[PDB]
Amino acid sequence: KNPKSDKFKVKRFHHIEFWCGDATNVARRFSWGLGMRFSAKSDLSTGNMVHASYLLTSGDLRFLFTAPYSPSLSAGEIKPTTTASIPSFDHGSCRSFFSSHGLGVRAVAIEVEDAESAFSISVANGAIPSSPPIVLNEAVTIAEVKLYGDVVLRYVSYKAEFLPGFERVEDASSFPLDYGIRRLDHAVGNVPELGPALTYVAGFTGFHQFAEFESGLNSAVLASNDEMVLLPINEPVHGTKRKSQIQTYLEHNEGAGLQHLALMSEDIFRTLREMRKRSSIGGFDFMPSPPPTYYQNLKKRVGDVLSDDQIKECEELGILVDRDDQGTLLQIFTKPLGDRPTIFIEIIQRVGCMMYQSGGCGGFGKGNFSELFKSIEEYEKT
Amino acid sequence: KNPKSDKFKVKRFHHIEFWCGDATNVARRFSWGLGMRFSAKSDLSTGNMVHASYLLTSGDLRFLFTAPYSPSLSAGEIKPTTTASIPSFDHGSCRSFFSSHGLGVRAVAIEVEDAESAFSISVANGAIPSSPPIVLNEAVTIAEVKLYGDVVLRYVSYKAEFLPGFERVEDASSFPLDYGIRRLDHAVGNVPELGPALTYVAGFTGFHQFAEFESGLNSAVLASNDEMVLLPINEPVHGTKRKSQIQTYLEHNEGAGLQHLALMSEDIFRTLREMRKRSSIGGFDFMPSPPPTYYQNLKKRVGDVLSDDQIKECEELGILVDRDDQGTLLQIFTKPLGDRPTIFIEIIQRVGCMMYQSGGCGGFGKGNFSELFKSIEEYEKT
Ligand SMILES: Cc1c(C(=O)C2=C(O)CCCC2=O)ccc2c1c(=O)n([C@@H](C)c1ccccc1)c(=O)n2C
Ligand SMILES: Cc1c(C(=O)C2=C(O)CCCC2=O)ccc2c1c(=O)n([C@@H](C)c1ccccc1)c(=O)n2C
Ligand SMILES: [Co+2]
Ligand SMILES: [Co+2]
């Protein structure tokens, strides 16, 4: 049941901003590893004396990488005279974020009808303000509230090309890489206590709990009216036969933050082939694959959805499969994206729920905890 | 004339250490962009709770990338009980270095006969100590003195595999990339005042001035006894028809630091082909190429050294050529390696001075300032 209680009009995920020490090297690594092209820039060459920001895109997916310059370059500036293209940026906030958490997501940005109204309504409904609404070139409005830890939810609204002050990247440095990734499906937070986290976010957005049904976690999913913005949140479950990956995250991240970005592919087979070819030459590594017992057990589970050849293609690529009441989910997880065992990426593709495909079709793979556990015990005894 | 005045026995360049915000992403980017393989690691998986350090190698060239973890992981440790594999490492020093300078070289490491003697002798002769000699596993000794700015000269000596506590990297993540780079030829500092810089370094090493003969700089080169360790230093020359790149460096770097690393290739043609193929897919960009007039003028200059086909191969790749009394130098420069217009890399190959090839054969390309200037004026008027 979807009560459609959004307190303001929400469209889709707009972009994800990483706060970096060096945006150039992170962005180039991500570009090669995920097959995203360099689409826009805001840096010294565009007049920005405050921060370096590089935008990668794949389909509708937008990854922004931002790092501060020396404050001495902009020492004479004040906010009214700033050359920053992202007015919410602050050197001290950025350095403190990165020193505290390492490389990770600062901003989960969603496009809304009117960022000013969304901001005012959110704060009126309990949201902690982070950056007030600011109009860029009388054309784009941006505002920010706290989401969890030091992650903000950023609202973006357009009167009618990424952001004013960003320049389109020259087609020469813009190699048209594409491994099939098309959009952000969901963005997941890790928190010490799930209850207060949910109550707070659902409080100021009107987002509703999304339908569901010892793995180290409890989780719940908040969704916008059309369930195209999906914000799962996890908390740890302490004490087991293995340590909670949520607890490990909080320890190495120095508290709550974004755990993983799930990127929808138009062809998860080709995406995973391309990413796996590049793992050891600058790209991303993937978690250890399930044993062959997991893939034998797939026939009994999704044999109606996936042919024997497509199941064997999942096995060759380490792809996991779960299923819902209405849809089927293919998923796989990278190793952590940086030095710390904190943020990682999920690649997914959803099968079913045709109406356009409805959001969350197939769930989030929670049934793969037991299915993975069972297959691992079976392969050991085998 | 080489007076051979080294105050201690110096062997060769050993490694270069970069201080990073995220060592993983910088190291993966450098690996792909330069064709260096992952050879050793010291991180959480090896028991290091203090810093993440990844070693890339190509031939004898060793690039180390190090970033701090959260201090909370090692809060109970003291230096006698440290899990750091590099005992000179300090969280606060590392974060302060990176916040101040951005991504850059912290340590220029040279192998010596006895790091303890080299340290004591250096400090006795004016060197400012940075980290005292420390014996690792009764097998490797390391010590550090200040070189310029926040760059240290690191001494390493071996009784008889990179460093104790580093683990060899699994041949699976160790893809055997190789674009032909073989060793560090020279490492270059930018300082506000050349005179005091030279006097200080030559004072404590015994390194001698290396033979030479408005471009924005003055420079001089310090060399070890066999002239295989080469340390040029630059200072700006203020006021011209263009701003000094040395001054730009000091401004964006917040003072003195390492300007460029020059990497010798066994085949600069293949190195530049491989690096240029990768520039727009995660690798490194190169400075703008000289006009065709520069390459026509090459026949009159090096036509005895390089055939017409090899000169045309230089033109296709943007390679610069200079010549000495005894040798010929092929060189090219990357764009800056990170966000700031500070550190860059030079690729070089030297022709001549056969005895083994003697160090510095062909010089450092100083004649290419005028040759580039002339050809640029000629191409404009053409
Ligand atoms: C993150 C994830 C999800 C996931 O997407 C997700 C949501 O979107 C929202 C609901 C909560 C949630 O979890 C689903 C299945 C996963 C994993 C996952 O992380 N892991 C590995 C990597 C692991 C488990 C334990 C300890 C260390 C690693 C899995 O095995 N499964 C099977
Ligand atoms: C660094 C360099 C060297 C070099 O290696 C070097 C040494 O090893 C020691 C002696 C001093 C020195 O300079 C040689 C030639 C160079 C460059 C160089 O940097 N440039 C570009 C990039 C540039 C010039 C001006 C303003 C901006 C950029 C050149 O054009 N030439 C021709
Ligand atoms: Co997920
Ligand atoms: Co040089």
Burial-class residue A300 by CB neighbours within 10 Å (0-12, 13-18, 19+). Answer: exposed
Residues 6+ apart with CB under 8 A from A90: none
Residue of B nearest to A99 (CA): B95
φ, ψ (nearest 5 deg) of residue B162: -65, -65
Consecutive H or E run containing B309: helix B308-317
Instruction: Measure the CA–CA gap between A299 and A311, rounded to whole angstroms.
Output: 8
Interface probe for B, chosen from A18, A19, A20, A25 (most Cβ of B below 10 Å), is A25
Instruction: Tell me the two tokens of residue A235.
Output: 């908390």
Establish whether A260 is an annotated binding residue.
yes
- b/e code A356-381 from CB counts within 10 Å (16+ = b): eebbbbbbbbbbbeebbeebeeeeee
Query: Is residue B176 packed enough to be buried (19+ CB in 10 Å), middle (13-18) or exposed (0-12)?
Result: exposed
Give me A90's structure tokens.
Answer: 């602050």
Taking the C-alpha atoms of residue A39 and residue A218, their distance in angstroms, rounded to an integer, is 38
Q: Domain of A148? A: 10-173
Cβ–Cβ < 8 Å for B364, B232: yes
Amino acid at B165: G
A31 vs B43, B44, B282: nearest CB: B282
Mutate to test the interface with B, among A22, A249, A253 (most CBs of B within 10 A): A22
Nearest to residue B261, comparing CAs of B188, B337, B339?
A: B188
Q: Are residue B139 and residue B267 in the same domain, yes or no? A: no
- The number of residues in chain A equals 382
Beta carbons within 10 angstroms of residue B237's beta carbon: 14
CA distance B145 to B226: 22
Q: Which two tokens stand for residue B361?
A: 């054969």
Q: Does A341 sit in the ligand 1 pocket, CB within 6 Å?
A: no
How many domains does chain B fold into? 2
The residue type of A28 is R
Q: Whole-angstrom Cα distance, residue B107 to residue B121? A: 19
Q: Are residues A126 and A231 in the same domain?
A: no
Tokens at B284, concatenated: 């490194």
Pairing between β-strand A10-19 and β-strand A61-68 as defined by DSSP bridges: parallel
Q: Does residue A3 lie within any of the structural domains?
A: no
At which of B123, B149, B173 does a domain end? B173
DSSP A236: E
Residues B164, B52 within the same domain: yes
How would you class A192 by CB atoms within 10 Å of its CB: exposed for 0-12, middle for 13-18, buried for 19 or more?
Answer: middle
Q: Are A92 and A160 members of one domain?
A: yes
* Cβ-contact B3, B224 below 8 angstroms: no
- Please give the single-letter amino acid code of residue B43: D
Spell out which residues of chain A touch residue B30, defining contact as CB-CB under 8 Å: 25
Helices (H), strands (E): how many in chain B? 9, 17
The separation between CA A8 and the C-alpha centre of its own chain, rounded to angstroms, equals 22
d(CA A215, CA A221): 17
Determine contact, residues A146/A108, Cβ cutoff 8 Å: no
Do B280 and A95 make contact, defined as CB atoms within 8 angstroms? no
Interchain pair A103, B22: CB under 8 A:
yes
Domain contains A4: no
Atom of ligand 1 nearest to the CA of A369: 32
Residue type, A64: L
Question: Residue B264 falls within a domain, yes or no?
Answer: yes
Query: Which residue has the least CA distance to atom 8 on ligand 1?
Result: A364
The answer on A167 and A77 residing in a single domain is: yes
Q: Pick from B2, B38, B33, B42: which is nearest to B271 by CA?
A: B33
**What's the one-letter identity of residue B226?**
D
User: Which residue's alpha carbon is at the smallest distance from atom 25 of ligand 1?
Assistant: A245
Which of A174, A175, A281 lies at the smallest CB-CB distance from B177? A281
Give φ, ψ of A27 to 5 degrees. -60, -40
Answer yes or no: is the C-beta of A32 below 6 A from any ligand 1 atom: no
Burial of B288 (0-12, 13-18, 19+ CB in 10 A): exposed
Tokens of B332: 């090219």
Domain-ending residue, one of A173, A194, A213:
A173
DSSP, collapsed to helix, strand or coil, labels residue A156 as strand
Q: Are residues B333 and B376 in the same domain?
A: yes
Substitution candidate for ligand 1 out of A217, A330, A333 with most atoms within 8 A of CB: A333
Q: How far is CA A41 from CA A89, A160, A365, B276, in A?
A: 15, 21, 36, 22
Residue B3 lies in a domain: no
Spatial distance between the Cα atoms of A113 and A220, rounded to a whole number of angstroms? 26
Mutate to test the interface with B, among A18, A19, A28 (most CBs of B within 10 A): A28
Angle, helices B292-302/B367-381, rounded to nearest 10 degrees: 130
- CATH code: domain of residue B31: 3.10.180.10
Q: Both B235 and B205 in a single domain?
A: yes
A153 and A295 co-located in one domain: no
Answer yes or no: do A253 and A107 share one domain: no
Same domain, B149 and B263: no
Whether B253 contacts B339, CB under 8 Å: no
Q: Which residues of B touch A63 (CB under 8 A)?
A: none
Query: Is A306 within a domain?
Result: yes
CA of B262 from ligand 4 middle (Å) equals 6
Q: How far apart are CA A38 and CA B15, in angstroms?
A: 32
Among candidate residues A200, A220, A202, the one with its CA nearest the CA of residue A212: A220
Interrupted backbone of chain A, residues before each interruption (C–N > 2.5 Å): 160, 213, 355
Enter the DSSP assignment of B79: G
Long-range Cβ contacts of B374-378 (<8 Å, 24+ apart) = B374/B297, B375/B290, B375/B291, B375/B293, B375/B294, B375/B297, B376/B290, B376/B291, B376/B293, B376/B294, B378/B291, B378/B293, B378/B297
Instruction: Report the C-alpha gap between B209 and B192 in whole angstroms.
Output: 19
Question: What gap in Å lies between CA B84 and CA B295, rounded to an integer?
Answer: 51
| Same domain? B131 vs B17 | yes
Boundary residue ending a domain (A123, A155, A173): A173
Contact assignment for A28 to B33 by CB distance below 8 Å? yes
Q: What is d(CA A295, CA A313) in angstroms, rounded to the nearest whole number?
A: 10
Contact A22 B339 (CB under 8 A): yes
Of A62, A59, A11, which Cα lies nearest the Cα of A229?
A: A11
**CB-count burial class (<10 Å; 0-12, 13-18, 19+) for B267:** middle
